[PDB]
């Protein structure tokens, strides 16, 4: 056997990101496993995952006790895999509802062709092909074309009258057709009515209700209504043919996300495990899918099947938004569940909650105290805090006897290290459980050692309510055994401190190259002039003035 | 985690990030928002931007077009969470050297 | 001069910021539940990752600041080293 050449390249970066929607066939092509079972956990001795289920270990492990199946690893070295679920009846989308109710007015419902003229279509596509097209310019073009297409109710290609398209309920589309006026009699509507008069021989309660009989567009007919549209009228419909397509707008194949994206919680009060709400909704959708199949072979009424179809379409519709208004009272759920849209929206979200926040470690916060015994760029750090914080550094030829003495001292004494990392083997070892006299001997070039904070290190010191750019600064660290923060009173004006109840915080840079960037730009001696006016902000305090 | 009783850290918001941007230091900003916050290695294909595994794609079925990048866990989290909204984020890898 | 270079007097609002910048990701925090997010997938526009906020969200070194210029290493190197002959393949010996 021979190994195939496989090497990764680092000199690459993302330039552009194009948005687009996938189609069910590409969804299955990307998917790995297909769930068929609704049971989450198998009925065996101990808690074990069920194959071809919602909680399967083929999409990614979530704990420190079971390895992965696709590629043998842990959940730390694991990205995630997706799955595909086949749906018996196609469902509507909650975000692509306005798009489809607009397209239904754009194209016909019996011809699948745009309602425009040959000369106006050319004038519009001429405005389409331009070297400069912003996203705000295409927002108004769709509305400009929609009214022009809705003004005319009869197409020029064929001779059929469409009508209008309106929504009703929550997910229901009725095509306003077969209008009955009192000026002209139409042969189409008369034939439509007389074709229903033969069905009044069994039930006498359908003739007065016949005037409200119209076309009710269901996902089934809309599916082939989207598959009969010519691909040549797609660019003028403001729809990128490369990314999107008129067809893949109806949910037919559900994409199962990885299991590592939905962790489970356990409470140690009554032995209670609780899965993610996403998993509960997925396993509830599966239970709604087989009752329709079994009802088919068993045989139910048309209303009994339409109710289950609507329930299956509504349960997947509340899985993403879960905030849709105007729902039936009998179908209104009592419990409150958060979906994908609610994972996005909210103060405790992921856009401005995790990405913008991104809280960091290796920091602290303590009440400040006055101490006019240091310089302008100095700050006192307590011994208890300096023992917790650690700075990693690689051992050079000149840093051999400087780190060997530190590791000989130990972590109990202030000058010393806690964690030792090897050169080749990427593993960290404690200095409290192991020996220190032997670790100093076994030391080679290129070893990472995390030592305690000593005097002469660039540390960051700032307050929480920052207004200007001078609210954060970098000073030199100094160890002082008093369990309090101390700094000169001259730099109290940039921080706007009151020295009565203020709580100021402190950060320690980890990368050595970034340690030099905070010393030249975020320097106390350098930053003495303010950018707004140009006057020195650090002069004196009222006591020194007096 | 949040809170001092659970042995948690401090939060760095935009209030202080604007002050770091005004100075002009970018290495320190990425060191204490990406290096000491969340550092993850992710493999991406250049032909069709998607998340693979062990340098192997499942859409194009090819091992030639493959590369690796350092992306914070929050960004990959959002990228894998946005795929359930019928949205496929396709990245375009460009040569930084050339 | 920032609201006078492109067109007329543009205001710093939610609508004028969409006319100034053309990034959907930064507007994702300003706008609401899913409108822009679904219209982006519907239209299918390409977002260019060249904004400082985009560089902080993604994790790319920003352009402004210390990332504008590029460094260069200096050492001993030869632009074009002497090549090695190809004794067999010679055009005069082939007569094609």
């Amino acid at each position: 056997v021979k190994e195939q050449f496989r090497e990764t390249d680092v000199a690459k970066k993302i330039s552009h990101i194009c948005f687009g929607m996938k189609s069910p066939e590409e969804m299955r092509q990307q998917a790995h496993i297909q769930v068929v079972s609704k049971n989450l956990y198998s009925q065996d001795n101990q808690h074990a995952p069920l194959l071809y289920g919602v909680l399967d270990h083929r999409m990614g492990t979530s704990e420190k006790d079971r390895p992965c199946e696709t590629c043998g690893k842990n959940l730390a070295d694991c990205l995630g895999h997706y799955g595909y679920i086949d749906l018996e009846l196609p469902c509507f989308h909650v975000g692509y509802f306005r798009a489809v109710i607009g397209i239904l007015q754009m194209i016909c419902k019996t011809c699948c062709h745009i309602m425009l003229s040959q000369e106006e279509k050319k004038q519009f596509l001429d405005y389409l092909k331009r070297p400069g097209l912003t996203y705000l310019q295409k927002r108004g073009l769709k509305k400009k074309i929609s009214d022009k297409c809705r003004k005319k109710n009869i197409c020029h290609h064929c001779g059929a009258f469409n009508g209008t398209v309106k929504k009703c309920g929550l997910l229901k589309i009725i095509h306003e057709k077969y209008k009955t006026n009192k000026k002209v009699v139409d042969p189409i509507v008369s034939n439509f009515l007389q074709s229903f008069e033969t069905a009044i021989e069994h039930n006498k309660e359908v003739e007065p209700l016949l005037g409200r009989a119209q076309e009710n567009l269901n996902p089934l007919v809309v599916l082939n209504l989207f598959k009969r549209i010519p691909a040549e009228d797609v660019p003028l419909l403001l729809m990128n043919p490369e990314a999107g397509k008129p067809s893949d707008l109806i949910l037919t194949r559900l994409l199962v996300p990885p299991l590592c994206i939905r962790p489970s919680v356990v409470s140690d009060l009554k032995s209670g495990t609780n899965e993610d709400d996403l998993t509960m909704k997925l396993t509830e959708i599966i239970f709604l899918n087989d009752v329709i199949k079994k009802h088919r072979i068993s045989g139910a009424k048309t209303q009994m099947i339409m109710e289950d179809w609507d329930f299956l379409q509504l349960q997947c519709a509340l899985y993403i938004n879960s905030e849709l208004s105007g729902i039936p009272l009998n179908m209104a759920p009592k419990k409150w569940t958060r979906g994908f849209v609610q994972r996005l929206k909210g103060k405790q979200g992921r856009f401005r909650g995790n990405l913008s926040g991104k809280r960091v470690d290796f920091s602290g916060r303590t009440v400040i105290s006055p101490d006019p015994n240091l310089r302008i760029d100095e700050v006192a750090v307590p011994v208890h805090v300096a023992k917790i914080l650690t700075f990693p550094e690689k051992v050079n030829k000149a840093n051999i006897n400087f780190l060997r003495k530190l590791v000989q001292n130990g972590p109990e004494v202030h000058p010393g290290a806690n964690f030792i990392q090897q050169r080749h083997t990427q593993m960290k070892r404690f200095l409290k459980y192991g020996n220190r006299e032997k670790m100093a001997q076994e030391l080679k070039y290129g070893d990472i050692v995390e030592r305690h904070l000593i005097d002469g290190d660039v540390v960051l010191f700032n307050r929480q309510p920052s207004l200007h750019k001078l609210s954060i600064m970098a000073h030199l660290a100094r160890v002082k055994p008093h369990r309090t923060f101390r700094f000169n009173e001259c730099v109290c004006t940039p921080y706007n401190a009151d020295f009565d109840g203020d709580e100021m915080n402190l950060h320690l840079p980890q990368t050595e190259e970034a340690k030099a960037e905070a010393l030249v730009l975020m320097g106390t001696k350098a930053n003495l002039v303010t950018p707004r006016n140009g006057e020195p902000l650090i002069a004196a305090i009222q006591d020194f003035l007096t | 985690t949040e809170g001092r009783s659970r042995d948690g850290g401090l939060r760095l918001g935009e209030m202080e990030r604007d002050c770091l941007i005004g100075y002009g230091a970018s290495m320190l900003l990425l060191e204490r928002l990406m290096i000491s916050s969340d550092a993850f290695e992710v493999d991406v294909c250049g032909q069709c931007g998607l998340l693979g595994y062990s340098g192997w794609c499942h859409y194009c079925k090819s091992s030639c077009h493959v590369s690796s990048l350092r992306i914070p866990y929050a960004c990959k989290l959002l990228f894998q969470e946005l795929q359930s909204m019928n949205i496929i984020p396709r990245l375009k890898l460009s040569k930084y050297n050339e | 001069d920032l609201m006078t270079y492109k067109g007329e007097v543009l205001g710093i609002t939610r609508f004028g910021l969409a006319k100034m910048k053309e990034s959907v990701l930064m507007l994702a925090s300003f706008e609401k539940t899913a409108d822009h997010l679904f219209d982006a997938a519907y239209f299918g526009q390409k977002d260019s990752v060249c904004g400082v906020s985009e560089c902080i969200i993604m994790g790319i070194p920003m352009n402004i600041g210390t990332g504008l210029f590029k460094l260069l290493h200096k050492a001993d190197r030869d632009p074009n080293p002497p090549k090695r002959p190809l004794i067999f393949d010679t055009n005069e010996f082939h007569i094609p």
Partner: peptide
Amino acid sequence: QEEYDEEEQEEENDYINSYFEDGDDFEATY
């Protein structure tokens, strides 16, 4: 341009949070 209100439209950020200390005495981790 619609007559909207800055408070209800723009959702409260860390900018709005007024960090001030008052006496107010009396999740899966791996």
